[PDB]
């Protein structure tokens, strides 16, 4: 459409802040908190960025669970299909990460979608990454569960082109 983003689509400070605005009821709150921390930890290991949880909408990355139309004009679609979406770094809505609350959120081996894997993917965008055409990359646009390490060369290559 006609919407444009502001800026070069990467962060220009090293301490990225995030706000968990709400929760899926599917997992305990602390388990969700840790799943997000673990997803952020994948990227903090390979970049000069730190990720700091804050408690207001002042945050660079605002995390929200939503159903259907949830405030940004890009509605979720109910069970399955679209699982989450994320906006590239920048001001305002930029940087944000939303998860479809109509999904059953699980962690590995759970019968639903892995919150950990989905968050790792979404946060990739929230740091500036596009989709990959490499099927085994984390940034591949289609969810496939796996227990093996999520990051592949293509992902680290993308992130390093952004942050060094």
């Amino acid at each position: 459409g006609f919407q444009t983003f502001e800026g070069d689509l990467k962060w220009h400070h090293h301490n990225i802040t995030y706000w968990i605005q709400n929760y899926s009821e599917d997992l305990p709150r602390a388990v969700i908190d840790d799943a997000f921390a673990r997803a952020f930890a994948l990227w903090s290991a390979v970049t000069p960025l730190t990720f700091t949880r804050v408690y207001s909408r002042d945050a660079d990355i605002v995390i929200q669970f939503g159903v259907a139309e949830h405030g940004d004009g890009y509605p979720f679609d109910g069970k399955d299909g679209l699982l989450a979406h994320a906006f590239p770094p920048g001001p305002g809505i930029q940087g944000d990460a939303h998860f479809d609350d109509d999904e059953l959120w699980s962690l590995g081996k759970g019968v639903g979608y892995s919150l950990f894997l989905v968050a790792a993917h979404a946060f990739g965008h929230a740091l500036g990454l596009d989709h990959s055409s490499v099927p085994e990359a984390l940034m591949y646009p289609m969810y496939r569960f796996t227990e093996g390490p999520p990051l592949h060369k293509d992902d680290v290559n993308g992130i390093r082109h952004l942050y060094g």
Partner: peptide, 8 residues
């Protein structure tokens, strides 16, 4: 816009 992640 955002980029979306899709299931099978």
């Amino acid at each position: 816009x955002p980029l979306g992640f899709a299931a099978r």
